[PDB]
Structures are given as structure tokens and as C-alpha cells.
Write a protein that binds this ligand. Structure first.
Ligand code: ANP
Ligand code: ANP
Ligand code: PYL
Ligand code: PYL
Ligand code: MG
Ligand code: MG
Ligand code: MG
Ligand code: MG
Lengths: 255, 255
């Protein structure tokens, strides 16, 4: 009569935010999910994460930011240089590769290097951004992924005010159609969606800049793309938005 | 009088394929490279690798292929399951992470999983592709990167003939404007540009398919994006096309 917890878990996997006797309930949902995949295959054919990356890219390129693609595999030394010592949480979340490298847990190091180098060639202000995979060992699984995708944009030189930063964040999220609230937490702000952190943003300069050969004011923010998708598509578990073999655009592939 | 080898190396770093007393030669090139970066920043602002990924995506999506984004960090078991044992070269090129995972050295495993799962929902033929980072420990540095980007497209079911495969390869490369030759090497072909391998392609089925729960004919090919850029932009060293902090769209960032 009553559905078991395992059966309910199975049906929830097949349930989409849009949906309103077990084997019958499962057959119904399976039919609907196959139809959803068939529609995607027939029309759009674009992956949610890939498409969001392209939409975000266009937004920043159009607003004067240079598109950067830097290494995902980085020197372990960069982590130390970011002020991440055995005293912070991140120190234990690092995925090491070999004895001198790791999977980047963030985009800041490579972007610091580009701000420094580009300042020798480009007119002020320097505006750049990168979107790409970042990695962190995590205990949570409902809001955190060990493999995720970050957008980090930044500007250095003129116009690096909290007002400008909040303005870009606002136009960005209103563009994507994602509700948010900017709250305080160098000047550090968090862009929240309810109790979910969409982004951490900062108004420099900060002491850390010296280690990277940076001596100008700057502003920047990092957003997790899977969290943006999660909110936008009303996914309950972030795994539905992740690179995966288990979901395609939020639809279960175990049909 | 004569330039030293080190000085020549420095000037070559600043030299672009388009270019026709050391400190003077360097000053000239530095000025030109800054101008090139300034033009990029003022107009396009798109990264070569990111843009190529977007162009390739559009090409396949438009031709009926579903865009896939799968994990870069994969189970070590996938490597074994691909028939990569301590008897092949690849076995020693794997970047291991923790005790059970690794950085994907190719896209095939995740795509095999998608072909199997999607066959339960999509009409025949199943057409999919993925573009993303792949990793291999390499000794070469002029044609090989340890961190590179692969495009792997494939079709399973109807129309999986060598003729169809060669046709897609041909339209694809003629679309990008890259000269090539298809040569023999299940049926295995190599798409060459002079002595450089652009792609390895295969007409299935093959014995390996059984391990992945695949029992239909298929065709597929894997292309390295940095090699395509290298050829298209006439870069002598592939590092000019790689994710990097040292070059931006082929222009040195050490100015
Ligand atoms: N493990 C993760 N999975 C998914 N997204 C993440 C993850 N870690 C960080 N992000 C995203 O990246 C953004 C910037 O990174 P960061 O500010 O370091 O996050 P955090 O401080 O680790 N946030 P949190 O762990 O939720 O308290 C975060 O605001 C999230 O949007
Ligand atoms: N280390 C690398 N750096 C850049 N591109 C690569 C690398 N390895 C493979 N590729 C690209 O990925 C394509 C498909 O992978 P694969 O057929 O396994 O290459 P391979 O057989 O390793 N080629 P090669 O090492 O040049 O003899 C190759 O044809 C290249 O275009
Ligand atoms: C390259 C800039 C300067 C140093 N930090 C870079 C930046 O833009 N910081 C703002 C915050 C970004 C998100 C943060 N790095 C995180 O991972 O949560
Ligand atoms: C998912 C298919 C079936 C198994 N191989 C996948 C494929 O498309 N193979 C063709 C060759 C691709 C390139 C090769 N995997 C390489 O890394 O060189
Ligand atoms: Mg955290
Ligand atoms: Mg934060
Ligand atoms: Mg090889
Ligand atoms: Mg090959």
C-alpha cells in the first residue's frame, strides 16, 4: 500500500520540478522523462551547463571583459601563495596530483597572474573573467559538488568601487533571472539566494595582492554555475546540475 | 653582433606567424604584441580555445548531435574497463587522484555510458558529442600537452558506416578550414595534417563494446582542439594554443 522509502527515492529521481501503486507511478514518470529527453534531442540539443557557460561568456565579453582559459591543473605552490595554510578549511579540501600539482579549487591564482601581465599591455581598467572546472573535497552533497564550475570576473584599476561591483552583480543576475540579496561578510560581500550562497565578492585592494605583484584597486566575484542552475531550474539536489552520467539537463538518465 | 641562442629564443617567443641588434628587435616585437593584445581587448575579446569550442559545439548541435558535459575526474576503474592495462603506453600516462580516481585521459568511457543509457530513451540513431579537458603525462612538448582539450563525437545504430564517418570528418574540417588527409591505421582511421595526427576515428562495432553494454554498430572520432588551433594559426609549438598563463590567443603574455 504505502510506498517504501527506497521506492520514494526512486520516484523522486524520476520526478522533475514541473511534475504535479509504485510500478505504475514509475512507469508514468519513465514515460514522461523519455519524452522530455526526446524533445531535447529533437529541438535544442544543448547541455544546461554548457549553454549557461556560453550565455555568461557573452554577457561579460559584451561588457568589455577579456575571456580567459587557464590551466585546471596548477602548481601546489599557488595554493600556499593564496594564503591557504593548514589553518583554513580549504587546505584539507585540495585534490593533489603528483607531488607538485593539484586541481584548482578556485580561479583567483591564474587570474591574479593575468591581471599582472595584462597591465603591461592593456589600457586601464583591466577587465577579465574565466569560467571553468574547480575542485574541492566536500562532505556535503546537497549544495556542494567535489567537481564544480566557477565563473570569476574581475576589474583592476579605475572604477573599482563597491557600487560598480554591486551593479555588475545585479545586472548579471537580473539578466539570468535569478533572485538574490547582497549581504556583508578588504570589503567582502556574499550574494545569497535564500540561505544559499551564489557568490563571494570582494572589493580590493587586499594584503594578499602584494604576493601576486598587484598594487592597484580591483573588484571581483566568483559564482558557482551549478548553484545558479539549481536555483533557476528549481532542482532540490545540486547533483542534478552537475557534470554527470546520472542526469542530463536535470532528467535522470537511469530510465 | 650575432644574436645568442637565448636571445633568439626570447625573440621567437615574441614572434607571431604573421611577422616578416637584440634590444631593438625585442622592443619592436614587444610594441607589436601589446598592439595585438590591445586590438583583441578592444574588439573580439574571445579566447581562441573557448571560441573554437563554441564553433565546434554549434557545428555538431546543428547536425543533430546531443551536447554532453561529463565528469573530468573519473573512476580509475574506467581506465581498466577501456582495455588499458600495464601493457599499453596510456597506462603510464594516467594522472591519478586519490586511490580510486584519475583525470580522464580520453572521453570514450563517459560517452559509452551515455550511448547505453540514451538508447533507452532516444530514437535511432543516437548522436552525441562532448568537448572538454583530458589529461596525459607526456614526454613531448612540441605536439603534446599534458593538459589538452578533446572533441569526441559519435553515432550509434543506423548509418554507422565508414562513408558516413569520413563525410562528417570532411565537412567538419572543411568547415574549420583545416587541410587534412584520412589514412588507415574494428576499422581504425587517422586524420592527418602532414605528419601531425589531428584525430583517431573508428568504425565499430569492436570487442570492447561488450564491456560497456553496447551491442550496436557505431562510428566516432576524437580530435585535439589545441592541434586544430596550432594548424589553423600556423603556431610552431602547441603550447601557444594551450590553456596557459604564458600565451593569450598565441600572443606572449610576458611583455
Ligand atoms: N563545492 C562546491 N560546489 C558547488 N559550488 C561551489 C562549491 N564551492 C564553491 N562553490 C561556488 O563557488 C563560489 C565561490 O567560491 P567560495 O566563495 O570559495 O565558496 P565557499 O566560500 O566555499 N561557499 P560555501 O562552501 O557554500 O560556504 C561559491 O559562492 C559557490 O557559488
Ligand atoms: N597529449 C596530447 N596533447 C594534445 N593533443 C592530444 C594529446 N593526446 C591526444 N591528443 C589529441 O586527441 C586525439 C585523439 O586521442 P588519441 O587518438 O588517443 O591520440 P594519440 O593516439 O595519443 N595521438 P599521438 O599521441 O599524437 O600519437 C589525438 O589525435 C590528438 O588530436
Ligand atoms: C583575481 C582576483 C583577485 C584575487 N581574487 C580574485 C577575485 O576575483 N576574487 C573575488 C572572489 C572570487 C571567489 C573566491 N575566489 C572563491 O573561490 O570563493
Ligand atoms: C564512445 C565511443 C565508443 C568507444 N570509443 C568512443 C569513440 O568515439 N571512439 C573513436 C575514437 C575517439 C578517440 C580516442 N578515444 C582517442 O582518445 O584517441
Ligand atoms: Mg566551502
Ligand atoms: Mg564564499
Ligand atoms: Mg599518445
Ligand atoms: Mg591516435
Amino acid at each position: 500500500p504505502a510506498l517504501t522509502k527506497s521506492q520514494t527515492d526512486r520516484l523522486e529521481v524520476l520526478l522533475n520540478p514541473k511534475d504535479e501503486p509504485f510500478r505504475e507511478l514509475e512507469s508514468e514518470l519513465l514515460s514522461r522523462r523519455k519524452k522530455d529527453l526526446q524533445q531535447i534531442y529533437a529541438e535544442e540539443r544543448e547541455n544546461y551547463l554548457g549553454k549557461l557557460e556560453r550565455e555568461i561568456t557573452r554577457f561579460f565579453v559584451d561588457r568589455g571583459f577579456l575571456e580567459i582559459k587557464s590551466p585546471i591543473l596548477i602548481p601546489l605552490e599557488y595554493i600556499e601563495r593564496m594564503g591557504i595554510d593548514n589553518d583554513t578549511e580549504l587546505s584539507k579540501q585540495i585534490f593533489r596530483v603528483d607531488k607538485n600539482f593539484c586541481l584548482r579549487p578556485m580561479l583567483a591564482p591564474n587570474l591574479y597572474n593575468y591581471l599582472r601581465k595584462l597591465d603591461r599591455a592593456l589600457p586601464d581598467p583591466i577587465k577579465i573573467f574565466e569560467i571553468g572546472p574547480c575542485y574541492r573535497k566536500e562532505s556535503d552533497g546537497k549544495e556542494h559538488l567535489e567537481e564544480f564550475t566557477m565563473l570569476n570576473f574581475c576589474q583592476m584599476g579605475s572604477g573599482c568601487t563597491r557600487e560598480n561591483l554591486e551593479s555588475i552583480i545585479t545586472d548579471f543576475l537580473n539578466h539570468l533571472g535569478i533572485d538574490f540579496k547582497i549581504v556583508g561578510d578588504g570589503d567582502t560581500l556574499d550574494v545569497m539566494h535564500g540561505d544559499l550562497e551564489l557568490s563571494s565578492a570582494v572589493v580590493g585592494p587586499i594584503p594578499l595582492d602584494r604576493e601576486w605583484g598587484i598594487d592597484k584597486p580591483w573588484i571581483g566575484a566568483g559564482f558557482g554555475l551549478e548553484r545558479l542552475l539549481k536555483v533557476k531550474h528549481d532542482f532540490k539536489n545540486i547533483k542534478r546540475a552537475a557534470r554527470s552520467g546520472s542526469y542530463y539537463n536535470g532528467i535522470s538518465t537511469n530510465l
